[PDB]
Amino acid sequence: IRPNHTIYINNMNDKIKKEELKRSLYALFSQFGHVVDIVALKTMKMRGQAFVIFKELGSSTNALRQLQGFPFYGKPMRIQYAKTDSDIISKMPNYILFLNNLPEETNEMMLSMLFNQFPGFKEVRLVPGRHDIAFVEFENDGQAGAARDALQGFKITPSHAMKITYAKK
């Protein structure tokens, strides 16, 4: 799963109506970040659950990591990143870290989405010499730290876990 603006939340009360539900979700997600839109239906296809669109993937991730199992309408609901992009966003330590145990089958596109999850990095270099290795540099060292702490033990193609460490001098 990747960082998206929409933060999904499931297992809210179904005895709570959709209007007050989206009201309370907006209230609890304004403290997390910029609530831009709210996708909440009351039909059994998405009943009892709702996805609130943050104007930041950092904001939706903040809400998902702060409110994991959050006491919400009678029973703590579970919040995480949306599976894909929402309609709203759809219409919308070092400089470099070395990635190890990387798949020699991995795709550059998914690799770029992952390295740019934290604000867009400089590049990723999947080494065509010594296989199963990368060297990725960031346009921001703060994003570098964030993505590297997230990536130490990163899960992509779970057949392996790829790790990002502070690349030496």
């Binding site: 070395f98 270099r125 080494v127 010499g129 010594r130 290795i133 060297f135 540099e137 001098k169």
Partner: protein
């Protein structure tokens, strides 16, 4: 919690700054009448700021009456001194300065750059309390008064002249009833005049003046204010006379005068007071009402162009001899021809000569600087901005092609014999591996 000292110091600083700002405003001048009215309200406001500080200071004696015992000791001291130091021995490492201890009330009770505004004084003015026909003290608010006089009278034999001749008198004969709703209408009109007088005079002691006027209505008008020789005295609101002062005083304690009529001394006191306020404002601003009457007369009789405007408030080239050059020379030089330079702010040039020079002439140099595209040869004779952009893009691509970037081409094989560019080469070189 030292109230004897801290309150006095704060009030003293605030009041010094307030008096200084007011004295500066009254020692300088404002050039406009709008400046004059805004500054007069501001001077009343500075006096009210000084007054609020003084009202907070003159009551803070509930701690002083008992602190005169505690601060009057010459036996204690350095013990409490060292204790205050033991508290003041917290970290003060906020290594920086800020003057916000004694220099603030200057920018609290001072003036502004383009219009005289302090910190609080940014929105204080006669803007919401001034009429356009008024001018911040030149005309009055009486057009609605005339409309209401019409809607009350129901006659077409009442104009500005009759309205002024009726509404100027203080105690002159009414043309409209003080026993009918005409009294309430006059009360409302004199209320508008009193609002003009209350917005025009913020430097007069309004509380004392209103108290003196209430004392006047309670003492000198109800105590025979219009002397005479039945004919001794009559009532302004009652419409009843007295055989003498004795008859007046004995009939003011009579039965029909107290409550035995709709025009008695209890149900008609407000109407008498409104008539009094109206007549008093008229007779005080007779020079203001006289200026308004002269205004009305001139604005009603003057010409329309000046009246509306007062209510609202060949081309040949120039030769070397400062003369216009011949028409045939003009035709030859093709100056009549207009060339639009959009990048130059939709500028227009005459003459293809000037037009061609214009690309190295300054205004186009700027236009292209603003665009972010260097005024180089390649863009000369391009004028539309979208075109300049697109061309700049393809030229970016061109120079990018012909340039030599080692970072991207220079291909490096690793010890494992497979190729990287030198960028990744040095990357994973110092990144512990290559």
């Amino acid at each position: 919690m030292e109230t004897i000292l801290e309150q006095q110091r704060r009030y003293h600083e605030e009041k010094e700054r307030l008096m200084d700002v007011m004295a500066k405003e009254m020692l300088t001048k404002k050039s406009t009448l709008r400046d004059q009215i805004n500054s007069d309200h501001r001077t009343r406001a500075m006096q009210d700021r000084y007054m609020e500080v003084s009202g907070n200071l003159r009551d803070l004696y509930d701690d002083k009456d008992g602190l005169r015992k505690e601060e009057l000791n010459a036996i204690s001291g350095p013990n409490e001194f060292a204790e205050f130091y033991n508290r003041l021995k917290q970290i003060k490492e906020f290594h920086r300065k800020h003057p916000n201890e004694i220099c603030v009330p200057m920018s609290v009770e001072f003036e502004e750059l383009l219009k005289a505004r302090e910190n609080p004084s940014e929105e204080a003015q006669n803007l919401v309390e001034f009429t356009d026909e008024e001018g911040y003290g030149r005309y009055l608010d009486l057009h609605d008064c005339y409309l209401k006089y019409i809607n009350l009278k129901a006659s077409e034999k009442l104009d500005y002249i009759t309205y002024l001749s009726i509404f100027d008198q203080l105690f002159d004969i009414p043309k409209e009833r003080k026993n009918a709703e005409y009294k309430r209408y006059l009360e409302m009109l004199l209320e508008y005049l009193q609002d003009y007088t209350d917005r025009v005079k913020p430097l007069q002691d309004q509380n004392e003046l209103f108290g003196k006027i209430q004392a006047e209505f309670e003492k000198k008008w109800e105590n025979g204010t219009f002397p005479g020789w039945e004919e001794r005295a009559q009532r302004l609101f009652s419409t009843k006379g007295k055989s003498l002062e004795s008859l007046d005083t004995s009939l003011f304690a009579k039965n029909p005068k107290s409550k035995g009529t709709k025009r008695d001394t209890e149900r008609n006191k407000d109407i008498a007071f409104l008539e009094a306020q109206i007549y008093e404002y008229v007779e005080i601003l007779g020079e203001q009402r006289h200026l308004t009457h002269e205004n009305v007369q001139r604005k009603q009789a003057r010409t329309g162009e000046e009246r509306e405007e007062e209510e609202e408030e060949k081309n040949l080239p120039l030769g070397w001899d400062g003369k216009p050059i011949p028409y045939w020379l003009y035709k030859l030089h093709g100056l009549n021809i207009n060339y639009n330079c959009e990048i130059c702010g939709n500028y227009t040039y005459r003459g293809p000569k000037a037009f061609q020079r214009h690309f190295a002439e300054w205004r186009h140099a700027h236009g292209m600087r603003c665009l972010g595209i260097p005024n180089t040869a390649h863009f000369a004779n391009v004028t539309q901005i979208e075109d300049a952009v697109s061309l700049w893009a393809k030229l970016k691509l061109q120079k990018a092609s012909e340039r030599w970037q080692p970072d991207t081409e220079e291909e490096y094989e690793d010890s494992s014999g497979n190729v990287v560019n030198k960028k990744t080469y040095e990357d994973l070189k110092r990144q512990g591996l290559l």
